[PDB]
Amino acid sequence: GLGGLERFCSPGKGRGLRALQPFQVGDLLFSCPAYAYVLTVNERGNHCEYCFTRKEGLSKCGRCKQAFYCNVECQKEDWPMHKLECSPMVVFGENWNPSETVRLTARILAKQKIHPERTPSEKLLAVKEFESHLDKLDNEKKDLIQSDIAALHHFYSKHLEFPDNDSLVVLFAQVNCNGFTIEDEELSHLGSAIFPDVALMNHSCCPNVIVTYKGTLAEVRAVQEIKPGEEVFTSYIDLLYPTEDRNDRLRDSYFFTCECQECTTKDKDKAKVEIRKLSDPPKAEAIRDMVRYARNVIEEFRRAKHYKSPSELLEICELSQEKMSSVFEDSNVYMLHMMYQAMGVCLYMQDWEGALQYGQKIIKPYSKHYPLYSLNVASMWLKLGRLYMGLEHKAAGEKALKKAIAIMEVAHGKDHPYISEIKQEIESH
Numbered sequence: 001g002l003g004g005l006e007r008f009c010s011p012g013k014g015r016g017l018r019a020l021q022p023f024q025v026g027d028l029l030f031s032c033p034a035y036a037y038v039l040t041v042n043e044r045g046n047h048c049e050y051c052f053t054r055k056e057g058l059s060k061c062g063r064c065k066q067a068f069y070c071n072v073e074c075q076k077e078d079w080p081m082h083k084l085e086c087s088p089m090v091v092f093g094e095n096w097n098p099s100e101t102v103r104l105t106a107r108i109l110a111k112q113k114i115h116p117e118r119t120p121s122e123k124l125l126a127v128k129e130f131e132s133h134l135d136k137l138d139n140e141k142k143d144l145i146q147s148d149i150a151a152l153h154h155f156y157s158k159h160l161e162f163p164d165n166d167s168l169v170v171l172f173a174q175v176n177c178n179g180f181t182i183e184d185e186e187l188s189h190l191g192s193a194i195f196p197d198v199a200l201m202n203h204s205c206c207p208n209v210i211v212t213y214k215g216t217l218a219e220v221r222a223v224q225e226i227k228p229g230e231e232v233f234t235s236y237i238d239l240l241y242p243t244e245d246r247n248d249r250l251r252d253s254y255f256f257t258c259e260c261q262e263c264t265t266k267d268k269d270k271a272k273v274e275i276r277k278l279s280d281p282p283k284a285e286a287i288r289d290m291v292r293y294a295r296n297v298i299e300e301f302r303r304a305k306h307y308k309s310p311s312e313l314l315e316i317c318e319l320s321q322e323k324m325s326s327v328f329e330d331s332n333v334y335m336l337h338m339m340y341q342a343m344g345v346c347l348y349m350q351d352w353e354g355a356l357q358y359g360q361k362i363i364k365p366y367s368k369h370y371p372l373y374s375l376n377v378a379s380m381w382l383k384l385g386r387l388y389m390g391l392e393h394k395a396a397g398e399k400a401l402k403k404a405i406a407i408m409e410v411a412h413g414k415d416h417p418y419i420s421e422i423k424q425e426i427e428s429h
């Protein structure tokens with residue numbers, strides 16, 4: 001197993017992870033090497049395929065020209081996984097489009113053939129033991145899994161010996177239930193991976209640990225003091241949202257309803273859905289209509305970023321914030337959601353002033369809605385610091401970069417390469 005920890009039966013939460021020793025804020029509970037992992041398509045050329053090192057001058061695979069490495073060692077070490085895609089990418093050309101889940105699942109199947117025995121990533125929970133929720137699958141989820149199985153056969157039949165369709169539906173369901181996205185220091189999507197021992201941890205909206213990544217290595221650090229006998233919880237979702245939203249997401253993606261202290265008390269729900277203090281106060285039904293409108297625009301924007309222009313996208317943000325502002329306060333999470341989306345459009349357009357304009361409005365409400373140590377808060381401080389630095393506002397930039405560092409020292413560890421990069425940014429300017 002893992003020193004100072006153990007697997008146990010968590011009542012009403014299946015299997016979980018329990019502490020056998022005290023952990024202080026910032027302590028590393030454990031590390032977990034990726035069992036299987038894939039660099040996202042949009043990050044190719046920026047990060048090494050094998051170790052995820054972000055570097056300039058990465059060497060391109062000569063055959064597919066769509067894999068980049070630190071050197072010939074990273075190239076060679078990645079080949080058992082890269083061969084599943086190398087020749088297929090040049091053969092299918094523009095037609096090569098498997099989903100990231102399919103790309104990851106192909107790598108799980110390849111690893112199972114090469115290394116059927118328990119790996120150092122499975123000291124407490126094995127990939128074969130993963131919870132699937134197969135019995136809970138509705139028509140929509142079975143249809144998505146069936147599309148994934150067809151893409152798996154379509155693009156990965158060369159080296160894989162597939163089990164029957166029944167074993168593949170269990171696998172794809174296990175992957176959705178236990179798979180991790182890997183994000184960078186700005187919470188930008190890097191790729192997807194399997195970390196079996198990390199997937200043993202259950203969810204809480206007031207977690208006592210945070211998961212971070214050091215290349216393809218997952219690290220688990222305390223964000224609250226943990227005592228012997230206490231269960232170790234991480235957050236599976238974005239904690240900005242009120243209780244109903246959080247549980248709608250946990251039910252849809254993980255088939256359960258959270259009963260943590262935040263979900264039971266609903267303490268932060270009032271401030272999260274803050275209403276304007278108007279002379280004629282807004283009616284209960286008028287609030288409910290705006291909450292419904294707010295969730296609908298969130299979904300509308302999500303679809304729109306796939307085909308609308310940057311000005312159309314910014315229009316959706318501006319117009320929806322205008323309609324919402326008649327009922328909702330600026331610190332309200334639905335207002336904040338649109339501002340964050342608008343900041344993201346600005347960043348893409350390289351409209352640094354516009355991105356800064358939004359980030360400045362988001363940061364104080366983020367600090368009040370998110371937990372004490374939050375990757376979402378650290379990432380916003382970091383973006384703000386980098387925008388201020390880029391726009392020659394070096395004192396404001398240094399202050400924001402040091403706010404990011406203070407959180408990241410707890411979550412990522414004092415010695416994290418991301419913190420060395422931020423300190424170099426402070427010292428170079």
Ligand SMILES: O=C(NCCCN1CCCC1)c1ccnc(-c2ccccc2OC2CN(CCc3ccc(Cl)c(Cl)c3)C2)c1
Pocket residue numbers: 101104141142144145172173175176177178179180181182192193198199235236237252253254
């Ligand atoms: O890292 C993530 N969040 C932080 C906590 C992670 N923790 C790991 C262990 C527990 C929680 C995360 C977020 C989103 N996506 C994934 C992800 C990564 C890999 C493969 C599928 C992935 O999930 C995608 C998104 N999604 C939800 C819809 C869904 C749910 C069930 C089924 Cl059976 C089907 Cl068909 C479809 C499919 C991971």
Ligand SMILES: C[S@@+](CC[C@H](N)C(=O)[O-])C[C@H]1O[C@@H](n2cnc3c(N)ncnc32)[C@H](O)[C@@H]1O
Pocket residue numbers: 012013014015016130131177178199200201202203204254255256257258259
């Ligand atoms: C990644 S697994 C975590 C380990 C899992 N408990 C097991 O036995 O394999 C995620 C699943 O654990 C369960 N789970 C996690 N957190 C929970 C919670 N707070 N309450 C209830 N069930 C929870 C759900 O069934 C969820 O889909």
Ligand SMILES: [Zn+2]
Pocket residue numbers: 048049050051052053069070071074
């Ligand atoms: Zn490398």
Ligand SMILES: [Zn+2]
Pocket residue numbers: 061062063064065066067082085086087
């Ligand atoms: Zn190649």
Ligand SMILES: [Zn+2]
Pocket residue numbers: 204205206258259260261262263264
């Ligand atoms: Zn909760």
